[PDB]
Design a protein around this nucleic acid. Structure first.
Lengths: 116, 78, 103, 47, 142
RNA sequence: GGGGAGUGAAAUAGAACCUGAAACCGUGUACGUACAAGCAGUAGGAGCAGGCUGUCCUGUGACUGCGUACCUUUUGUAU
RNA sequence: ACUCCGAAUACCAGUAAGUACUAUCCGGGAGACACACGGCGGGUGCUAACGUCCGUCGUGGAGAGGGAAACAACCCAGAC
RNA sequence: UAACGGGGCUAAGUAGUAAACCGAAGCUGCGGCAAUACUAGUAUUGGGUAGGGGAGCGUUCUGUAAGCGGUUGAAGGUGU
């Protein structure tokens, strides 16, 4: 039997085109360009799911360093202090505390200083 | 603008085929050599091309022997 | 008042009445869950810091829902080498509402 | 019962279909490799 | 859950006044540059200018070590053929005092829209005075 | 050529006539965009506008990080 | 392309512990037989070449990630 | 400019000492999937081109089917 490809052929093309909504120009209109676009978006999305974890930790460390140095200790010394004090609060939390509860951060800094 | 050289024979895969301590059956080639680089000792024959081979089963033994301090291949009973 | 606890492989600053999604827990929906590993409690200026854990630290919570997160698409694409691969992912979570924070 | 009959496990095996994409593992070259006589249509070598 | 983000609307930017007199250009610039980004704040958000307005006074009195006064060269190309222009530190301190420090800071700031925005918050002055009394700048030993 | 009227179950079934995709071209609305440098996305993210009622949904996306299409052929291609 | 001498290594074999689905054999199916750079030993070349030809090990090929500004082939390290 | 990646640096260079920290898709933690062994759990394993092997999705057509659904709306189209 002879198979016509139309109906399924369109469904594939449409799937990709729907994933390419919002891209500029051909990249949202034309299957050949959109496909390439939706692939590279997936590639970037894979790479960035990893690199998100790096970017966020850099941000926290930068913020903790700011707060520690306002409380008279370097980031490097503060982490050592906390380690020596057996305080296992993550950088994500520390950095949250540095913004939202400055006093608590200072306590932790004072604890850290004592351990050093 | 050319080389008078170019030539070389096929390598003849000479050498010790069974080293000290190796267990050999009678007939096993031990050494392939040109001349008697190694001499035939007890339980070792020598072919026309100076191939040393085991006349009996046992263990290959190399040994310097004699007034010229020549190397000898023998098969030791073991 | 807030506290910091360890659940999943992660830490969570949490206050009473806070819903939050964690890595799937082996608990039924509606259940109470008590998290033992509390790192820090803070009631105003009073800050209990664990070393590692706060001594009597317990966060109680209700299990709201176990769910699958919104799908992620994994695209692997090696250009010019005739190799491509796709794969979906929905990560399981447990939604918990914090009931109480014991200092 | 005509809707209930089925072959033995192992009895039937889907034939190999070359040149239907990457996922099949028989895309592009169809398992012929790259270039040369043997990759060409009608390119067999006499036993 | 989500890391805090500084909001361009809400971010509090403080005015400070720094005296450059007798300060190592580069060492001064690196501090100013970090303050303009707002690396000194816990609210430091990379995509937001949460930095601080820095006024510098006595920019013409900024110091430099070695024979850098006579050997540090500033280049500019006009984009006309053979359009490279050189000036030494000493000569640029005479011609345009303020440029020396501003250039220093500019290099140390990130490139692009936000970094250009940050630099806008640097107000360098050759003299001992500045026009931003109304902003009530705090003295800052940087 | 059209608009009414009328016909018809249907007239975006009106003869350029069943269905009526895509490329492509328009009008309208929301958001963005005239100091800003590159595979045009991605991870993040303010603001604005619609819903629903703000640790929601939808659209847009200032700003930041990262990021040289695809195929083929090759030792090796952003080339 | 000399040797009165003469290593390290490597190889051959045996004995032995521990670790490992290893080795081998017989069948079905291949693909490949343009390699590259880097280290080490060399020939060739100018102890030139991102040169060329071998030996051997690594990586690339067919390998992402971090470093080396950017940089297949270097350093670190193997991405359900 | 153009032989520090730039700014800039007289230490932010070079050598060293001490104690820190940053840093990867490495390791760990937490959740999940798969292959292969074993005895559902363990244990190991899951980069990949040529290529081999395994398991599927969907399409048209035949039976099942004069069954089942359909003008109280099929196919197709377009959204969610």
């Amino acid at each position: 039997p002879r198979v016509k490809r139309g109906v399924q052929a369109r469904a594939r093309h449409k799937k990709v085109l729907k994933q390419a909504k919002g891209y500029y120009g051909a990249r949202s209109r034309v299957y050949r360009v959109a496909f390439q676009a939706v692939t590279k978006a997936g590639q970037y999305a894979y790479r960035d799911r990893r690199a998100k974890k790096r970017q966020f930790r850099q941000l926290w460390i930068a913020r903790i360093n700011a707060a520690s140095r306002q409380n008279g200790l370097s980031y490097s010394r503060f982490i050592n202090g906390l380690k020596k004090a057996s305080i296992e609060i993550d950088r994500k939390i520390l950095a949250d505390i540095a913004v939202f509860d400055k006093a608590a951060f200072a306590v932790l800094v004072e604890k850290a200083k004592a351990a050093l | 603008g050319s080389t008078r050289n170019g030539r070389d024979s096929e390598s003849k895969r000479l050498g010790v085929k069974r080293f000290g301590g190796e267990s050999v059956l009678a007939g096993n080639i031990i050494v392939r050599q040109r001349g008697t680089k190694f001499h035939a000792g007890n339980n070792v024959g020598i072919g026309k091309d100076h191939t040393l081979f085991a006349l009996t089963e046992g263990k290959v033994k190399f040994e310097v022997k004699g007034p010229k301090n020549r190397k000898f291949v023998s098969i030791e009973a073991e | 008042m807030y506290a910091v606890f360890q659940s999943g492989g992660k830490q969570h600053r949490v206050s009473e009445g806070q819903t939050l999604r964690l890595e799937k827990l082996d608990v039924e929906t509606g259940a109470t869950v008590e998290f033992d590993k509390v790192l820090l409690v803070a009631n105003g200026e009073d800050i209990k810091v664990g070393a590692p854990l706060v001594e009597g630290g317990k966060i109680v919570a209700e299990v709201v829902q176990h769910g699958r997160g919104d799908k992620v698409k994994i695209v692997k694409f090696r250009r010019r080498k005739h190799s491509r691969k796709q794969q979906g992912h929905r990560q399981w979570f447990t939604e918990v509402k914090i009931t109480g924070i014991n200092a | 019962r005509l809707n209930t009959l089925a072959p033995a496990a192992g009895a039937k095996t889907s034939a190999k279909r070359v040149g239907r994409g990457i996922g099949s593992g028989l895309g592009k070259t169809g398992g012929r490799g790259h270039k040369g006589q043997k990759s060409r249509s009608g390119g067999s070598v006499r036993p | 859950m989500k890391t805090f983000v500084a909001k361009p609307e809400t971010v509090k930017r403080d005015w400070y006044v720094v005296d450059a007199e007798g300060k190592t250009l580069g060492r001064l610039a690196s501090e100013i540059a970090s303050r303009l980004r707002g690396k000194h704040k816990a609210e430091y958000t990379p995509h937001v200018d949460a930095g601080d307005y820095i006024i510098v006074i006595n920019a013409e009195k900024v110091a430099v070590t070695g024979n850098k006064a006579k050997d540090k060269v500033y280049y500019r190309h006009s984009e006309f053929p053979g359009g490279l222009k050189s000036i030494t530190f000493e000569k640029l301190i005479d011609r345009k005092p303020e440029m020396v420090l501003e250039l220093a800071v500019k290099g140390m700031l990130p490139r692009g829209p936000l970094g250009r925005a940050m630099y806008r918050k640097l107000k360098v002055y050759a003299g001992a005075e500045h026009n931003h009394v109304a902003q009530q700048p705090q003295v800052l030993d940087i």
